[PDB]
């Protein structure tokens, strides 16, 4: 690929630092989609919002797009309380991200084992993580620093509330106590 | 991306100048589609036409493709009169564009605020605008210089008339009097 | 684009020469598809064949894929006789092509006029032609050297016969005696 | 293309060596898909597994994704016995692969003949093979070193068994005793 843009997701409420030798392009919040690849720049939205769009009928009457109320975001490691959270108190539980100006290609390598796979000779390790596949394994988006059973949250703009999201189509790669059965990965960049 | 071609839309009846250090490849009119990304070269058509195609049956009989009569274009800032306009008088209301030979990558950054987002260190500002998302935020096509409630017009080739177009699927990014609620953006290019 | 491969279609029964400074990668026949972009390498097939595939059931029994009998090819300028031609006598009417190792980007520019559009400053003209759009205008595939009312032929492998093809979806760009109404184009390459 | 990653499939139970001047990125097993292009890095999975995914409901209960039990792999040249094989004894019959860090572009050229097509002047031969097209001819994935009537096997995770797979949509290119009718190819890389 020619992914000059590398996206780093912290899975914490702190903005991740870009690796040395890369310009931060921008920072924000870890977005999956509004009703995509975590390695693409679209996965990093500057400001958290559950209702970010505005529709305009032919004339001065413009309203907030409120039909497709749902949005999906990468969560932090900090456990969500056992009760749905209002959108005003949800930010602490949303992952932060940065977009970085990679000068070379980055790739994710996966072990399907408890051992971290090695970076190729002459390539530099950017981070290590757990193998995650979404509805592409070579992409950096498939390598999340922390394992979470339910890594995403769903928010309802109209309902004003948020909670963990049971995705039917996205899985973790296994090995061939629970973290001991998840495949490990490393994101590597060529010098 | 490897978008060597940068498209600039003026939203006026004047052809925009390519930024210094870029060859103009060609100029024309701001096309959305005939019955796409504003950042791609296909969005800039050399000459305005509501019926640009020709079909040829097996033999000398060739006719003008007249079934799918509708075309869609980016409008100028100048208000369209309160009455549909004949295709012969529509040109003043169609945006002009230029295609420019970018030597480096360009990206749009978005604030979701009244403040303009900053270009990354060592990158040069090309233009500033308002955040527009169509049925990709990293693309320069998402950053239009002027905000317009209804930014597009629809033309009917058979009906020979044109008017503003209420798109169901395309929105403006909001902030998290009307221009004060639209997200600002800047298109930036690396040196 | 990063189309290092440039495809040249002769619309004659002679193989076109690659432009000076480009390696011929290979030559062959101008293929549209078997039951695509003329600018891509897949449009140039080494040897003409109406039945090029072989299917193998689990075992030694392998047979010729004969269900989807139809293939589509770019024709030469030489008129096809007024009577369907057997597949053994069709080669003279099939366009030849070459694939060339472009060192820089090539683009098609279109005038929507009788005048040839100019190449950008510092770019070199590769060929001139007529604007053709298929079911992308920036691509070299949209610029064919000769205008033909029905530019393609259809061949039936089982029926063993070939004739001109009336495509419902592909058109010529017009201007805004018949050649006088077709848009002109030039394929240009940067130095 | 900008396929910096070249995938080499051995069609044997031995890992292929990357060509001289290319870093091995990783090695593994020749995967088609789980219920793609053999030239892409996704076709090379580090460890063989018929059930590689893990699903997690909202809570501590995580289970093995067992609904879409089927996986598809490139086989070795060694004949599979005339009786379905248990998944524990299948590895010897699965092709191995390596992913290599190509510094230049690689392409497959095809003859549609018994003769090997020549590499372009100044390009180096990487391997020779037989022309294979799947449900793209320019890609290295279309050139397999060994011809096999049924080149793939299907495995059933729940059924725990594996056997050859009759693909309806994938074919061999022909010429215009059985190997004598299959098109030859060569994968070539520019210096």
Author numbering:
A (entry chain A), B (entry chain A), C (entry chain A), D (entry chain A): 3 to 37, 45 to 144, 155 to 195, 213 to 227
What does the paper say about this structure?
Basement membranes are extracellular structures of epithelia and endothelia that have collagen IV scaffolds of triple α-chain helical protomers that associate end-to-end, forming networks. At the C-termini, interactions occur between the trimeric NC1 domains of two protomers, forming a hexamer of these domains reinforced by sulfilimine cross-links. Recent studies in one of our laboratories revealed that the NC1 domains function as recognition modules, directing the selection and assembly of α-chains into protomers and networks.
α2NC1homo resembled a canonical hexamer, except for an increase in the number of subunits to four per protomer, enlarging the equatorial circumference somewhat (∼70 Å diameter) and widening the central tunnel (∼30 Å). Therefore, the two self-assembled noncanonical structures of α2NC1 or α4NC1 subunits may lack some structural elements that are present in the canonical trimeric protomers that could intrinsically restrict the formation of protomers with more than three subunits. The comparison between the structure of the α2NC1 domain in its noncanonical homohexamer and the same domain in α121NC1 (α2NC1α121) revealed that there are conformational differences that might explain the greater number of subunits. The presence of an isolated tetrameric protomer that is not associated into an octamer in the α2NC1homo crystal is structural evidence of weakened interactions across the equatorial plane. Our findings of noncanonical assemblies for α2NC1 and α4NC1 homo-oligomers and the structural changes observed in the chains forming these noncanonical protomers in comparison to α2NC1α121 and to the chains in α1NC1homo, α3NC1homo and α5NC1homo could imply that chain folding is closely related to protomer assembly. It is unlikely that α2NC1homo and α4NC1homo could represent stable physio­logical assemblies, but the structures of the individual chains in these noncanonical oligomers might provide a frozen glimpse of transient conformational states in the process of NC1 folding and hexamer building.
